[model samples]
Target: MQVPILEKFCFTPHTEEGCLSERAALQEELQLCKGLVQALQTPSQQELPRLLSAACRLAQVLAQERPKLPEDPLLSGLLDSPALKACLDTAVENMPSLKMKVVEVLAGHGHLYSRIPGLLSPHPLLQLSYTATDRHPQALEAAQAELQQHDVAQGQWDPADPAPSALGSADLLVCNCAVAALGDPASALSNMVAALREGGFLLLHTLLRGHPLGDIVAFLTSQGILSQDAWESLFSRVSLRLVGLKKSFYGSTLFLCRRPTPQDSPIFLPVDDTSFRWVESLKGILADEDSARPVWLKAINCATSGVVGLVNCLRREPGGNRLRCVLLSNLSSTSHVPEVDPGSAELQKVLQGDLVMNVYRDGAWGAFRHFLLEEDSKTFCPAHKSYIIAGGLGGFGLELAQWLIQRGVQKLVLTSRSGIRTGYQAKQVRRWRRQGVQVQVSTSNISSLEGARGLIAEAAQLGPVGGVFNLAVVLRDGLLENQTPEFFQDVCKPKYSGTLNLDRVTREACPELDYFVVFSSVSCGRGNAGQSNYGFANSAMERICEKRRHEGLPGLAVQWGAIGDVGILVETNDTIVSGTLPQRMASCLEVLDLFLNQPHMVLSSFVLAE
Candidate 1:
């Protein structure tokens, strides 16, 4: 009783060389197969249909020789049909036993028609499917309805279809179905080769006819008719390079083939996401206080007060006249000290010296305090009376106000076009007044010459003015094309002409004024696409300070970046709404912090984070 060719292919070969290769390849391939199988069979399931298809193909090839041989009569019946022969030939040529192994594996795992269920009773995938197809009879029908929501149609390659076209090829194409209908094995294989992009893969799996006389022998000896050799021959005829083989439950052999390429396939490289995350964490740890402060500043601008606190502790100091006991004689009797403009002689004297002296005999501290309170309680006044002005009554103004008040400012004046009558403006004024902080609101518009003079007049009445803080600007949101000439003038008037007017009036009123601090935007230094007007205005302001500095006036111009609490910055759509107010306030405080502690005079530009 001799073994047929099909049986010979299935059983371990008796020849030493053949047996050795079969065992070694099977052992190596099975190890890989087992690992994949274990992964797929895990308690924790994965949603990887494509990967499963590949794995099943590999498993089928490994188990190729296990099925019982079919009888001679059936083999003859199958061979007599040219269509069936063509189908078998094409199927074998395209995908050897590897494809059948895939189908067998899928069938065994009960994932053929139905998706694999997880350990949990009501899985999310199943639940979603059930909800989507409650009354639908077929999964295809449900899929059709679900896809309609996204304007997709089944079987039709619409322009808006999300599925990639078959023309577009990938490295591998693992087939899970029969390919017998392709007509010609060689021609079908050629089509597959054409369809595959360069360096692409093609995996096929299905049934195959075995050796010539194996079917007859199987019928006489009650053995399986299928032979591994016949399947191997079919694949070889199509010039497929055999990589692996496995047995099927029906006694057919599975074959794995790789299309030859001019160049070797590139080795896959793995990336460790956890390792990269750890590296990022370490880099964050290495950043110093100054570097770290910017992040907190950004968080503050977003109004995350808690995040600001977590970044850097902010404490409120006790407020009162906490000046140390000093002899009156020690203080120079500089009565009628030359009244200087804000950021001038008085400012330089106060900022340069520890003691702040009044040059104007008629109560100069009152007027100085007004401007000081508006800017910040604790200002970097390098002179006697330096006034710091801020554009908005929002974050920057509030932070400046708080700083000045805490520093024992005698008086504080704030200027807004809204005057003291505006609801929110009035509320802030009343709040400060109740705290023993003298806050005066003037309707002097910085854009108007009359308004600038009016502001100067009001400040002079309180006492000899010291510093002038040019911190007024208009913010308009639009593209350059949309901005009218009038709009440009309106926006620039307050910041540009107003600053010039204030400077002239202050210089005339107080010849002794030293430091002139102008608040400009960094956009002036670095042109912003849609902010031609704004950039131009700020540029002019910077030039003013430069000119003043050259004229022997102790002037400083600051080009500030995006300040926190400005609606343009902090109110972005993507920004998290949580803790926004606090974040903005903290960012505002940080700007003042830089002014007082780390002063940069070179470029005079500071980018305050938002």
Candidate 2:
């Protein structure tokens, strides 16, 4: 007449309050459900297992979604247990809303095996949980029956002390599954770290990134599981390191993380990632680290926060960690970052790969784009305009040429070390020529002044050098310590010497140059790990753009994010932010259309794919 679990706990459908702890409770009940199903004698013997399994299946589903549940089959690749599979097999064919009934029964029988509240009995390890707020004392009592180990303290989470000091020295700490519900995983993890003494254990008993769970996590925005990159980021940022990966029940692993023996107290730092200010803050941290204080930066806002992740693990050894992120920018946000680095500091090793830097994008038109707004051909091109695309034969250079030609510019001098050498390049040259756009191929290394002179002189013969788009770059990615002057110069000269060379030549050959577009990157903004040289070079290039603007030149530096399937960005398939990223060639073109009109200094964001 009554559901089997109702005697232990209450379960009403569509309730969110007790979902987690109740789910925890259900996992304990599952162990008993199988034996009870086997022993039951009912009129519908065949259907009895089915009904019980149906209820058990729901429990498994929730468990499967969240790995750290009491029993974690979810942590392993396989989800369903044999008994559950057989039960479900019959439940599907013989269900009569019996699934819901069984779940209700299971939810009610919470006292079987949970500890954090009205549901199951707690564990014996004597840890603390923030799940039960108002009833901390009562909840502790309810759970204390099974907790015969050390003392079990309670914080249950109050605004004043979301994590009470009662857990300042805990043997175990509990956290959320996937929701930012416990707060930014960084702060929450740090606080949890604060709770543990040296070598204490921490458990992530739920998963917020799968099927139905992922959908909610993503759409909810305010809450959800972070990407794998983010998860790694979180673990690294905290004082705990993962160990003892055991498959607990549900679809998760019970991670036995060890707390740092001499753990420094970590702070929850809120930074202004939108401004260049954050970079300066990072510089300050360098000095602080000398005093040996563990500091952290936490970003709760999902604004356009661009840059290299500090948690990418900057290694001093060659062929070490080569983590990097490329973001597309259009000066969508206004950041007064003028420092092009006086160069090098004591070194900052920031932890946090999971803590997201909320970046704000599409924030504004670039200075140049702002001028070009709502205006027609006059903004992008002048009458009888002939442009010198310095590195125009490459991916970005070629794409820019197409946009230029579309805007009614017929004369273009495209340059590079090996001018139109590839069959594809040769074909494109012919194609543009056939379309009546006079394509002058200048094959020379423009990183040198002599090379710049030759290209400009050759281009000068075609027509006036009305504009210049310096889009040449050499990627020499590696750890800062591993970087050599030769490789650094190889990457720097392209922007430094190359841009300066063009800047000088453009003034001599074409005094009235319309636009001087420097193709920079967002790496210069947040400071990427492997591309320290590239960031340094781009930072200088940005200054060049700024100086030219002050000198009344149509100069603008556009720091673009990653363009999927194009440029050297995708050359290393391993480092590519290449999953579900909307950074397709189409997106690149669209951004170009919007960015080319922006200001002298511009910065934007990148939504790296998971």
Candidate 3:
């Protein structure tokens, strides 16, 4: 004879409607119980008789309810099963025992053991038990036997038993609701830790006193079963690092803790003595939230090095000084040169060639002539147009494109690895075209040398390229050990390799390239715990910019902090882990604007927001 699957009992609200009604208010509750049942069945033998009894109880409660009963096909189908009938008989016969079992399952390792494997590996788990509700002699014996079969080192009947010292030293320890009932949960946890060796991990999941299951907890507390302060006090006394929390059941909390390791501590950067004063000063300004001085000044002393480097390049050769004018001429063919109608006074004035040309007029060029006059307060000298690479069809790229168009960027080259036809890329092209801005599309992978060559070739077909802005970089998240080789390869291929590719191709294709602006990350300057690979890749790329200065290249690497409302930072709103969004955004703008103001600096790498 086949052994029966045990019936599981779950507490659900009674309603004056058909049992398991499709439109029932308690549908979610019912579904959750069903899900629990499905999860439990995969790991344990099912007791059929107990299951039927639980179903019968639910049917009886619904039948006697003051609310009118409605027909439910699902309910009828469940009742018709022979196995369910047997389960109901057995469950009714052992209602008290079944109720205890439910409590044990709800407040025991069974729930955790079932789910923990998915979040983490199972090889590290040594032993687990269902002791509380297993009053039955045979059940307790079976539980112990299961532990032995799994090679679990120890299985203790007493909750007060010292945790196995061997087990304490293991990688992770998960305790679910076991100690919540103790007079002192902290003491119970201490006893649990006594079993663990140093550097072991402890995962504790318990119900917060005043959380979602407020009603149920209050009811239990009124019965003198649990104190409201018990759960809160347990967390306070623990020495474990609180990674984060998640809602387990209606009122329960899931807390993750890791035993301290020598290597696991907060990271710090060793600032150079030469840059220490400026770093300190900038930090003070940032601490006070001052907006006047650029934020990069706090991290690096010579923030204007890149601008100075560019100016030095101009002084080195008369040919390099006039390179900007040559790029302007090439860009002007595709650029929307304002019509010189003889009737319009503004047009006639511009046509008369009476515009005074100066350094400010050449440097502070905008997207449109109106913006140039309004913002920069300088008339275009026909030698002030800049080239921009609209890196993708995303929000930042699109917004920057629109801003560039407004600022009087005459020529825009939109490129993506995936050819830009539909989506945001197509929309950007159409919008700029309507503004009469000269726009071109190129399908090239910026990270690949060949793709970079293709992009430069396409841009050359149009005109001489002035400044190239790189906004393409891959975003990823994972601990150093947890990250696969593929993850490192994928991120480095685009960010590190791609930047190098673009720099090489630009030099070969257009040796007279004016400015090469590379957008990097603040991760390069300040390390992130889980982002070692990313930090390394970005840091190496920024170092490339530093090396280019000695090679007579006008290249600038903007080591950006988090950009507000863009990419991964915006999607999850993970500001706590990333940093304040608004501050990061302001910092990015400050660095970009500073680069625009002094184009002759070779300050190399500047660390933006902290």
* Local distance difference test scores for all models: 0.37, 0.46, 0.40
Ranking by TM-score: 2, 3, 1
Q: Candidate 2 residues 482-501, lDDT tens each?
A: 55656657876788778878
Model 1 regions lying over 4 Å from their true place: 1-394, 420-424, 512-514, 566-568, 571-610
Best by TM-score: 2
Give the range of the ten consecutive residues with the poorest summed lDDT in model 2: 2-11
> How large is the C-alpha RMSD of every model relative to the true structure?
30.9, 19.8, 25.3
Alpha carbon lDDT of residue 118, candidate 3? 20
lDDT (Cα) of model 3: 0.40
Compared with the true structure, the alpha-carbon lDDT of candidate 2 equals 0.46
After TM-score superposition, the amount by which residue 70's alpha carbon in candidate 1 deviates from its true location, in angstroms, is: 81
The candidates, ranked best first by lDDT, are 2, 3, 1
Which residue segments of model 3 deviate by more than 4 Å? 1-390, 420-425, 572-574, 577-579, 583-587, 599-610
Q: Write the per-residue lDDT of candidate 3 for residues 1-610, one digit (tens) a residue.
A: 1111111111111101132234343345434444544444431112222332344343353234211111111212222222222222221221111121111211222333223322121211112222222212342343454443432333332334454333333344555442224334566666655544443444554444443333332332231123335643554466554333333233334444433433311112222233223224323433442232211111122211221112112212222211110001111123333322336553332222111110111122111000001111211212244365636455456665665565567676777666664565677688778877778766777777878877777776666766677776675555433454456556666666776787787777676677676665545432344554465456445545544654677676654445555554575323534332222343444345545544332221222212
Which candidate has the top score in lDDT? 2
